[PDB]
Design an enzyme around this catalytic site. Structure first.
Site, mmCIF file in Angstrom:
data_model
loop_
_atom_site.group_PDB
_atom_site.id
_atom_site.type_symbol
_atom_site.label_atom_id
_atom_site.label_comp_id
_atom_site.label_asym_id
_atom_site.label_seq_id
_atom_site.Cartn_x
_atom_site.Cartn_y
_atom_site.Cartn_z
ATOM 1 N N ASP A 101 0.832 -1.226 0.000
ATOM 2 C CA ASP A 101 0.000 0.000 0.000
ATOM 3 C C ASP A 101 0.858 1.264 0.000
ATOM 4 O OD1 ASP A 101 -2.360 1.537 -0.017
ATOM 5 O OD2 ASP A 101 -2.828 1.221 2.089
ATOM 6 N N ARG B 12 0.104 8.965 1.183
ATOM 7 C CA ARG B 12 -0.672 8.968 2.428
ATOM 8 C C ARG B 12 -0.076 8.019 3.474
ATOM 9 N NH1 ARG B 12 -3.699 6.311 -1.350
ATOM 10 N NH2 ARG B 12 -3.688 4.047 -1.015
ATOM 11 N N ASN B 13 0.742 7.052 3.038
ATOM 12 C CA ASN B 13 1.353 6.067 3.917
ATOM 13 C C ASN B 13 2.873 6.214 4.042
ATOM 14 O OD1 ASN B 13 -1.143 4.905 4.455
ATOM 15 N ND2 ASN B 13 -0.980 3.497 2.710
ATOM 16 N N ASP C 134 2.301 3.384 7.367
ATOM 17 C CA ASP C 134 1.193 2.445 7.569
ATOM 18 C C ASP C 134 1.019 1.422 6.422
ATOM 19 O OD1 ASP C 134 -1.150 1.200 8.466
ATOM 20 O OD2 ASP C 134 -2.332 2.971 8.556
#
Ligand SMILES: Nc1ncnc2c1c(-c1cccc(OCc3ccccc3)c1)cn2[C@H]1C[C@@H](CN2CCC2)C1
Length: 296
Positions: free
Chosen positions: A145, A149-150, A163
């Site tokens: 992923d 955003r991670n 994350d």
């Protein structure tokens, strides 16, 4: 004999952690900013991020939460957010991490919109992310992923890998759910991941390409104006993201390499770092996995 989570040297007494505010929710539960005592060697106190589960009453979520935290126990890389501890005995279940004070890369990139980041700054972010990913791949970890955003931003602006819990199912290794209730980050996904759910270091390189495009557009939405279902078909039919306005040629060239349709035609993360290493800040040599003795 038992197969439950076994408390170890990572376990932290509950009384040594306080929470002070909400940072936001990614996978599992809310992440809080707080303080933990005795988690860093020769620091009495450490500012930390503290992660919870979402559903208190779920034992399965609890076990999965702790299995995923246990994965991080193995990681020691300047360019991956570090685990600092775990509170596994009693409720609530807590995961204590390195506090990334500037938040997620996507929010950071958006904040820079109204001069825009120079190529050098962009390369520096790219190399840090690639270095984190090279370390993880070298340690047999496929993130699945990778997206702005991670990735997370430090006080000193270092970008680090974050994350990875959003798309991991509790049963996946032994059981399959027919059809699939699974979350799929389609706008970041390689054609083979879209096709068959296959995730490898090669598909992580594909996502990396999309993170470069996010950096160069200041976190525009990839394939803006296509639905999720349209993106899936578009990319599987060989569709590609356009070169962003004023994108340095060298960055787009990297994207193009990451977005080879055939996974075996894509560069590795080590090959990406190799191609840009001369444009990195001098301190990169001293902190990177790439230049470390682990890189063999
Ligand atoms: N270290 C941190 N420091 C400061 N803020 C952080 C973090 C992490 C953070 C960092 C690294 C890893 C991590 O999951 C690991 C994990 C996975 C599985 C089980 C247990 C643990 C969370 C997330 N956030 C914020 C919460 C916000 C989520 N948003 C951004 C888009 C939605 C960002």
């Amino acid at each position: 004999a038992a197969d439950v989570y076994v408390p170890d040297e990572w376990e932290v007494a509950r009384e040594k952690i306080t929470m002070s505010r909400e940072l936001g929710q990614g996978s599992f539960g809310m992440v809080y900013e707080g303080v933990a005592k005795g988690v860093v060697k020769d620091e009495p106190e450490t500012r930390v991020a503290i992660k919870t589960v979402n559903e208190a009453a779920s034992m399965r979520e609890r076990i999965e939460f702790l299995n995923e935290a246990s994965v991080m126990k193995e990681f020691n890389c300047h360019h991956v957010v570090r685990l600092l501890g775990v509170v596994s005995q009693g409720q609530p279940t807590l995961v204590i991490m390195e506090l990334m004070t500037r938040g997620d890369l996507k929010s950071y990139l958006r904040s820079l919109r109204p001069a825009p980041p120079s190529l050098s700054k962009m390369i520096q972010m790219a190399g840090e992310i690639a270095d984190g990913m090279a370390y993880l791949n070298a340690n047999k970890f496929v993130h699945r992923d990778l997206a702005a955003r991670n990735c997370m931003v430090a006080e000193d602006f270092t970008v680090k890998i974050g994350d990875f819990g959003m798309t991991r199912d509790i049963y996946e290794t032994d059981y399959y759910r027919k059809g699939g209730k699974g979350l799929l980050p389609v706008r970041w996904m390689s054609p083979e991941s879209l096709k068959d759910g296959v995730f490898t270091t090669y598909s992580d390189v594909w996502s990396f390409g999309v993170v470069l495009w996010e950096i160069a557009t200041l976190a525009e939405q990839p394939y803006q104006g296509l639905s999720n279902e349209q993106v899936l078909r578009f990319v599987m039919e060989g569709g590609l993201l356009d070169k962003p306005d004023n994108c340095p040629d060298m960055l787009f060239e990297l994207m193009r390499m990451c977005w080879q349709y055939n996974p075996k035609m894509r560069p590795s993360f080590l090959e990406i770092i190799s191609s840009i290493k001369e444009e990195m800040e001098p301190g990169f040599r001293e902190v990177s996995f790439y230049y470390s003795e682990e890189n063999k």
